[PDB]
Design a protein around this ligand. Structure first.
Ligand SMILES: [Zn+2]
Ligand SMILES: [Zn+2]
Ligand SMILES: [Zn+2]
Ligand SMILES: [Zn+2]
Lengths: 329, 326
């Protein structure tokens, strides 16, 4: 398809490289970083931590991350740009709606939210001219009317622009079938959609049937595991009780079923978070000191060790994300 | 002195004050992310500047914009329209009815620190300091509401800046708030129980005034009527007449509590936190905007025999005593 918009401008598909398809520099809420930077120690400290972390990912071979932080999760596109330039890693920014829409979003019609996603894709985010490269939607629980409205607006925005849609499916309730029904009712191609956090379930029948329809399957919280931290209830709620190897083996399972082309792999990492319990980044850092480099440093060799061909792993980490991100009407 | 979005001003410069107003009701960062929702940022500024100049021409010198972070306070917007309209604007910290998860997850200690940052250091990177703390409860009080009230009390006690509350729903919700504030050691004279004109339970208001609370009779033009085929109106507006609300002002004066009264419109010039184009419904019902209090309510009170000195006390002296950090 087309070139891809990043927070440093449009880049050629050939320059995307090894891509982490679901990441965050900072998880918060709109305007939060600007209003209370000292929550993160300082804006400067957060920038330093993110740049260091992204450089380590880069040394490990990562060339692009997709930051799927929305307006309501506190996307600060100036932060993303500063960090992208200093780490020299491409960052694709997002539009869409996560789990915490304010009333200003919850009161909107499907037409109005389609207009908001389009502005962020076609014109730019705020007054920056930086255009979103991906539409993020999030649902948890059983779907609400508002969730359906958001999915329809995302589908309509994707159809008008070619940019893909990524979903947050929480927590293991296997919501992809419910989401796909709505996407398809709007005429959206499954090839434009990633059903994210699919690694939260071990239901391979569910995963395979979505893959077979041409959905991308986001196996993208691989390092998250609270095993060993059972005394911390907040760790278990956020990271789950399944090992990173259990998650990673789903990648190999879908490969072995013939669906290598449908797999997107990431960490769903963060360098700062205020949307949850205080200091939770410290708990994450203790589980996975590799941060975003976890995928290339730990998961790729694990999968090779289990017999996955290197070409297959390159197709999953380079070719699939390029095919996914490249705008395609 | 009192902090405004243009810096500190002397108490004597505050003048006729509207103590509960909004330039724009939205959510944090919404104006910067979606200005076209309001036509443009420029269009909102022009509408707000004209409306503040109307209020100024009717005698208003200061408004207190009680928009918090989560209601979309944009202090650069406030500074721009304050400067262009030559109307002082006092900005707010606190928490309204739509806190994001980043606020809902915080401890009482953390929320106290946030409010203190906005009062003592400044809002965002602007150096503009909040001059009032807003808290909002709708319905029956929750654990999170109680936490915000205590953080507000503590921020008030550390800075001397007053607390304004949004009451709505459950009966006599000012009593719940008062009990919490008093448990923290906050003087009632630092607290305005807002939207008190939404009730006709005069004994409830007199009792709070008697304890030394300020009584915010501040939704007077939202009385509405004539919009029965507009459900969004009646739920946000109300089903009473503005004169009946205004009569509450005279009733508290007659009971001896003129010094406890604060009067305002609770107006705004743009809103995205409710139904689209709700601003049009508002502007159709009250085309005076923030000038409604000086153009309609003050004459009304005068006709009912309220003396000039009493009206000056309510509109100039009470807000100055309330806002001056103590
Ligand atoms: Zn997610
Ligand atoms: Zn995520
Ligand atoms: Zn209110
Ligand atoms: Zn208000």
């Amino acid at each position: 398809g087309d070139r891809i918009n990043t927070v440093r401008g449009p880049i050629a598909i050939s320059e995307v490289g090894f891509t982490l398809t679901h990441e965050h520099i900072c998880g918060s809420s709109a305007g939060f970083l600007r209003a209370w930077p000292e929550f993160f120690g300082s804006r400067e400290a957060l920038v330093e931590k993110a740049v260091r972390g992204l450089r380590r990912a880069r040394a490990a071979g990562v060339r692009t991350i997709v930051d799927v932080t929305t307006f309501d999760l506190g996307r600060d596109v100036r932060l993303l740009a500063e960090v992208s330039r200093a780490a020299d890693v491409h960052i694709v920014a997002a539009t869409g709606v996560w789990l915490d829409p304010p009333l200003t979003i919850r009161m909107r019609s499907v037409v109005e939210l389609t207009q908001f996603f389009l502005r962020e894709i076609q014109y730019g985010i705020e007054d920056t001219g930086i255009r979103a490269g991906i539409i993020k939607v999030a649902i948890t629980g059983k779907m609400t009317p508002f969730h359906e409205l958001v999915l329809r607006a995302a589908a309509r925005a994707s159809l008008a622009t070619g940019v893909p849609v990524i979903t947050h499916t929480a927590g293991s309730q296997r919501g992809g079938e419910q989401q796909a029904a709505i996407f398809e009712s709007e005429g959206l191609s499954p090839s434009r959609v990633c059903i994210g956090h699919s690694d939260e379930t071990d239901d391979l029948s569910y995963l395979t049937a979505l893959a077979a329809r041409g959905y991308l399957i986001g196996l993208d919280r691989i390092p998250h595991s609270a095993i060993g931290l059972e005394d911390n209830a907040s760790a278990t709620a956020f990271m789950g009780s399944r090992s990173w190897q259990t998650r990673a083996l789903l990648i190999k399972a879908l490969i072995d079923q013939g669906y290598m082309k449908q797999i997107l792999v990431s960490n769903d990492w963060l360098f700062g978070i205020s949307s949850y319990v205080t200091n939770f980044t410290d708990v994450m850092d203790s589980v996975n000191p590799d941060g975003m480099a976890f995928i290339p440093l730990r998961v790729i060799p694990f999968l090779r060790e289990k017999g996955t061909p290197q070409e297959t792993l390159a197709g999953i980490t380079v070719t699939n994300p390029a095919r996914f991100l490249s705008p395609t009407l």
